[PDB]
Amino acid sequence: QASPTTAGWSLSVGIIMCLCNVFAFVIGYFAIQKTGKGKDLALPQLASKKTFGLPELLATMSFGHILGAGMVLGLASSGI
Amino acid sequence: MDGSYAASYLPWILIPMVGWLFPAVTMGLLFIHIESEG
Amino acid sequence: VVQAYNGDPFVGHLSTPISDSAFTRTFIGNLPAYRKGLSPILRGLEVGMAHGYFLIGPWTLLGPLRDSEYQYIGGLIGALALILVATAALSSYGLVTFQGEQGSGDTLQTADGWSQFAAGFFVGGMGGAFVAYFLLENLSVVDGIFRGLFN
Amino acid sequence: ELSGQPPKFGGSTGGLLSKANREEKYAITWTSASEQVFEMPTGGAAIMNEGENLLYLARKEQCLALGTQLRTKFKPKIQDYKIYRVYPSGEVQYLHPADGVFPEKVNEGREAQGTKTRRIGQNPEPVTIKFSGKAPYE
Amino acid sequence: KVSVDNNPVPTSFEKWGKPGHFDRTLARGPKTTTWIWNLHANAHDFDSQTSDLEDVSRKIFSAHFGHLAVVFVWLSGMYFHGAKFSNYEGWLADPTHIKPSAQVVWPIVGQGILNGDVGGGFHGIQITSGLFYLWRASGFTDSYQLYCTAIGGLVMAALMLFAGWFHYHVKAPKLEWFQNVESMMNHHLAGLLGLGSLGWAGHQIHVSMPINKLLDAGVAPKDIPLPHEFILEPSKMAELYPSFAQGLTPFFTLNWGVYSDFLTFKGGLNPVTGGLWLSDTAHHHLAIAVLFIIAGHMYRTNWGIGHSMKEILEAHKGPFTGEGHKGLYEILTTSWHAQLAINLALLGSLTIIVAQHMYAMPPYPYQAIDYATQLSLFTHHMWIGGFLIVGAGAHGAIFMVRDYDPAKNVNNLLDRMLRHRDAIISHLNWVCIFLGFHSFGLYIHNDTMRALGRPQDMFSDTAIQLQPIFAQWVQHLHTLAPGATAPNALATASYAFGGETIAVAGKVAMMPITLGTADFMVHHIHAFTIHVTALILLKGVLYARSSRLVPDKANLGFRFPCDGPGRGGTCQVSGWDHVFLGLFWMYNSLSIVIFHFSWKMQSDVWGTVSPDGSVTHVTLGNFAQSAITINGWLRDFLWAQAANVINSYGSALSAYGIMFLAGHFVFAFSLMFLFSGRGYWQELIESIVWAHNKLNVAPAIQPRALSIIQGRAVGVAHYLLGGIVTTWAFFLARSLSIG
Amino acid sequence: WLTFYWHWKHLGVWSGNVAQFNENSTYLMGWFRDYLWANSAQLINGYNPYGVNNLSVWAWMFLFGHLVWATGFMFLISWRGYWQELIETIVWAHERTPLANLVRWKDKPVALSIVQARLVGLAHFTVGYVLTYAAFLIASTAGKF
Amino acid sequence: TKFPKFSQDLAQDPTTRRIWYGIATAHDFETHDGMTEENLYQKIFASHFGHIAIIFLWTSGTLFHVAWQGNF
Ligand code: CLA
């Protein structure tokens, strides 16, 4: 009665879709700018990730993870 | 509440007198007297 | 939305949606106490009828005679006595404050007017309670009247 | 007659009451070199206009509480303040800097009253002034 | 963002021999006895000592390190007493028949009688701290485990004490450093509470849970393997809770529900334990932990991500409130009293939440059985929470006197409400009068109707009744919550709302607490007593600076007796005197709360359950019919339950007997100070002094009656002491004798 | 002290149990337990959830005395300046309340004087002192004889 | 004549303090306005007569009630 989804497969797609959503969220609006030391990424691309500066990519991967977990476990719990 | 003692109808009216009339009047009359010129 | 009262900020009062809104100015202003024009006699009559009417309430249902066949009369008698005191309390206050002079601004606030208001309140109050009692005692009649029982 | 600019203020409840329009209210004027924030004795905060200000308060003690503040809580110590007692009859009455100079400083012209050609311990016995409306200090 | 001044103050013992050095008034010397009292009452008032906000913040910072140290010594004392002067091991063997006892009394002057028989062949004083119940749930099974814990406390104690010295005499933080609020919060929200909750969940799962599961089986402590042995053999940790076969990686693969073997949501009480499921509290703190780490990533720091509370506050303006929260950031990062005022208000209200939650949902084994510990932990945390929310009014007022600046507060929320303080109090005044009649007035209506032989008129379940329709409706929802509004929760969070009557041994651990008109009334007594206490304290904050009576009250200060007999009398207008009166009402308020608690649980909850299931309460349910008149409280609660303590002479409880009187004494003694004034007392001393001038024994430090403030401070100090000593003895003697 | 001493001793004489006083009046708990707590039993049951008897008055008067006694503590502990500042807010309320400002007091509301509060505080403290004790003296003695 | 006729100091008090202090100083004749020594005693002398009568009126109350409603 405490039923989750416990598997691989599309699990990574779920969180990566959220990582993407958050990278869209951060550039959407933020205090996006130089903080700490960022390896620097050019324009948008895979660099759209690293363009957010040092903490932002690192901070979006955080939110993107939790948003994934919240989204994954929520889809797995389904409606019943 | 009525008692055997004679004149058993006095307390019937007089407790009301002491209770409502005697105070209401004196309370009022005193209230008027504090009010005046001075 | 909340500012100074009448533009005078040093008047110890604020103008708010309760104190000085469009509504409350209208409502309170048209209440019988402040309605422009009316003679004090009618002012009190109105305030009486309203208060006397509802004042039978508590004793009619929660009085000592609630638990007998006399609850309706026990309530009326309770309201009557309560109003009588209120009348004298009114007539007395006027008798003392308005001892000296007058106040030609508001007729309600002088010896003559305030006595008219006291008298007005008395009859209004007495009438209010008595009629409300009349409807509770003959409530059976009122019931059928509304639901077309007697046609 | 004499006047000023009412300080910029949203309003408070600690202000005037019926006494102001029945018995008496007090008025206080002062001149300031700039618009700056000051504390109302009626609570809250207000800001005085640059130049002449005018303010009605309910009690004499309130005005003097503000007057002392004006003279102690500003870099330009405002000692230019004047207090009046205004009756509903229109009659006004000068009160503070009474004669002209503050009472702190001795000034010629002031008539002495309340003084005693006597030590405080040299007052008469209460039995001496028996059944007379007078007290020992009279 | 670290800034520090190196060695700002030398470390010398010269100042120790110069008392009152911290104040320029006392520094020169004592001429009267008033100097002595003033040395003590100004000791921690660091504001009045120096106006350098950097210097005081350093004093406060190292004051805390000193405090954490004594609390460590105290806490270590409890562990040491539990290790060497306890019957804990004896209690762990037979939890349901042995009474927990620490502290052995020395046989002398006949005081050995206080070492009463608590079962298990152990003589000592029966404790009500619930420490034994805490130890088991914590996984303690040996005296040595407690002993090592006691030493660790002294280590910490010494370590905390060193830090206090180090951070004021070696490396004192700059004022800039203390002002890192956004960052300070991120660490407490995640480092203290987050990791603290996560770290403890790790202990519960690896030590407490498996061990405590064996105590359900009753393996007995010595047969149970040591805590660390569960880690050396993951086979052991697997044999219980099968979900360790796939141990790690379901967490990282997000399987999670595999762990449901030991991370449950039963939501109830382990029927053998009488306490909350450790499987729940572990899953709980694991959930709280994560939530707290998360919440610790909201605020602005050095990496540009986060929030500026200054931005958030200022960006909260509305039509009704003018400029809004503008300036609130500043005053909360410049005034300590501003912070302390809030922190007390919440910490104090929280300690109350602890009490009301710990009794309905007993989190420890065999706690619910011990009605003494249940009554003792509840009323305890009640008072602490009570005292704190009074100081919340003290410093709330001190801020207004000392650190409120009109220029930095213009037409903002703070200033705006100061501009209708007369409107606030006028209504809070009325509410208190309304609650006053419509709560207490009801009891007087009953007591009078009763005596007049008119029981049909009074307010009662049997006669006319005021039914708490809502609170009852709330219970109905809480009991019907599982399988609907809480599908993954098996049973309701607390059976106080409704359900099966849980029993352990032959006693009631927890059962549905029905609400009647008897309860409706005391609830509105509580609302009444609370509102008056707020009124006294709130009025004390808003009128701290000024009034129509004294516009220059702010200049007089926070702590002053009065402004002379003028104006009809101006005694006790100060904010300090609003804390003074606020204390009596905090007391009067809570005394009724703990009296509600004691009688209600005794009468309508606690008691002995027969095997069949029928319950016999200790007061036979006389609450709902007697708790509706004062004479009923006087008779069926006080007069009745006080029989235990007054007859305690000659028993182990004889202490509570004479302590019940001791409270009474200092209570009356307090009235000596609260009813008089120093005017009389100074004149008396003059006559007394003369007798010493006569024999040449007059003291150099001239005798002086206490200050008017101290006269009041001492007054309330004794009144609240005795008032609580009395209850303290009455509750213990009562609860220990009943079970 | 005086009347407690007179009463507890005669309650032994009238009872034939002088041994009670002689053996328990040498320590304070004895007075608390044997004289106060015990001889209240009939009194506090003047009325109860079950019935009413001739001691119903004294039971009621017992609490009444307790009430006045403690109402005395207010005037004795709390002093004027607090109350004066609380009254003016009420003064404010009435002047601002519509319909009510229609009535204006001919006597300005003010807190009791300093001496007055001591006096009234003492008055209450005294009334409650005798009314509480009297109701106990009569009920305890009349109830027991 | 405002209340406290015997004290203009109190009569002028525009507050409620007048009523209270008017009562508490009523029986202190020495404080009264224009009170002489000769006019003092003459008020005391009369005040005693009224007091004696009350005592006799009181004892009359006990006798009267016992005879009327008592089982003597
Ligand atoms: C945005 C991410 C997110 C988060 C944090 C949650 C969190 C939660 N959901 Mg899920 N849900 C989501 C997305 C999310 N959901 C999506 C996209 C769907 C499909 C539309 C669902 C459908 C769903 C169903 C059907 C159910 C839930 C339920 C729950 C709760 C049950 C606990 C649990 O089993 O899971 C694991 C617990 C966690 C992952 C803890 C998360 C708590 C954190 C740390 C707070 C995060 C705050 C947020 C990120 C703040 C910034 C965002 C901003 C806009 C404010 C939990 C509060 C259950 C419920 O509550 O019933 C109504 C349930 O039955 N959800």
Ligand code: CLA
């Ligand atoms: C001071 C002595 C005294 C006291 C304490 C009482 C007390 C009482 N009387 Mg009695 N009464 C008294 C003298 C007293 N009476 C005398 C001398 C007579 C014959 C004239 C009566 C004739 C009388 C009748 C017919 C009745 C009572 C009744 C009562 C009871 C109800 C009150 C009432 O009706 O007022 C009535 C008062 C009067 C009729 C006038 C009484 C005469 C004067 C006023 C007594 C002197 C008072 C004293 C000087 C005032 C000092 C107080 C000071 C602070 C001003 C009450 C127990 C009623 C009752 O029996 O209830 C069960 C009732 O029906 N009384």
Ligand code: CLA
């Ligand atoms: C969060 C903790 C905390 C902290 C750090 C402070 C800190 C401070 N307080 Mg606050 N206070 C607090 C909580 C706190 N308080 C609470 C919860 C209340 C509500 C009661 C108060 C009420 C309060 C008042 C009214 C005042 C302060 C004042 C002060 C300042 C000076 C205090 C002093 O001189 O000590 C001196 C301490 C003493 C002289 C000891 C007094 C005797 C005590 C406390 C009785 C204790 C009873 C005892 C435990 C039981 C009897 C046992 C006995 C028989 C042996 C200082 C900044 C003062 C201030 O701001 O200066 C103007 C002041 O006016 N506090």
Ligand code: CLA
């Ligand atoms: C135990 C005696 C006692 C009593 C009865 C009170 C009563 C009161 N106090 Mg407290 N007070 C006390 C002790 C007491 N105090 C002590 C010892 C202190 C010092 C610590 C204080 C400090 C204090 C403060 C600081 C405050 C109060 C306030 C109040 C009032 C709150 C408003 C209210 O309840 O509405 C109505 C009154 C009652 C419900 C009391 C019962 C009255 C009855 C049952 C009515 C009787 C019927 C009717 C009058 C019959 C006619 C009789 C007539 C013909 C003579 C209330 C009058 C607060 C206040 O002023 O109001 C906001 C206030 O802030 N008190």
Ligand code: CLA
């Ligand atoms: C023996 C006869 C006697 C006489 C003729 C006087 C005469 C006088 N005294 Mg008093 N005195 C007396 C006895 C007497 N005294 C006793 C026995 C005491 C000790 C208590 C005192 C202590 C005393 C003090 C301290 C003072 C006087 C003062 C005075 C003078 C003014 C009195 C006044 O106006 O205030 C009148 C005051 C009142 C009327 C208030 C009294 C309140 C009452 C009676 C309590 C009632 C409570 C309640 C209703 C009772 C029923 C209970 C109910 C609730 C069920 C006056 C010359 C005053 C003075 O200034 O001297 C020049 C003054 O300061 N006297």
Ligand SMILES: CCCCCCCCCCCCCCCC(=O)OC[C@H](COP(=O)(O)OC[C@@H](O)CO)OC(=O)CCCCCCCCCCCCCCC
């Ligand atoms: C059983 C009893 C009868 C129940 C009837 C139901 C009544 C429900 C109570 C309504 C409360 C009204 C809230 C004002 C809604 C409100 O906040 O208005 C909005 C206004 C401020 O709004 P702004 O637009 O300024 O907001 C934006 C900025 O201010 C940012 O802060 O607040 C005020 O004006 C102050 C008024 C305080 C009113 C004092 C009420 C005291 C509490 C009374 C309720 C007690 C219930 C117990 C729990 C608290």
Ligand SMILES: CC1=C(/C=C/C(C)=C/C=C/C(C)=C/C=C/C=C(C)/C=C/C=C(C)/C=C/C2=C(C)CCCC2(C)C)C(C)(C)CCC1
């Ligand atoms: C407005 C309103 C309100 C209020 C309400 C209320 C409070 C109610 C009421 C009500 C009432 C309270 C009413 C009343 C009335 C009345 C009437 C209608 C009367 C009458 C009468 C009569 C008709 C009588 C007559 C008579 C006389 C006079 C004498 C002789 C003859 C006879 C007996 C016939 C509110 C704000 C809340 C809301 C909104 C609306």
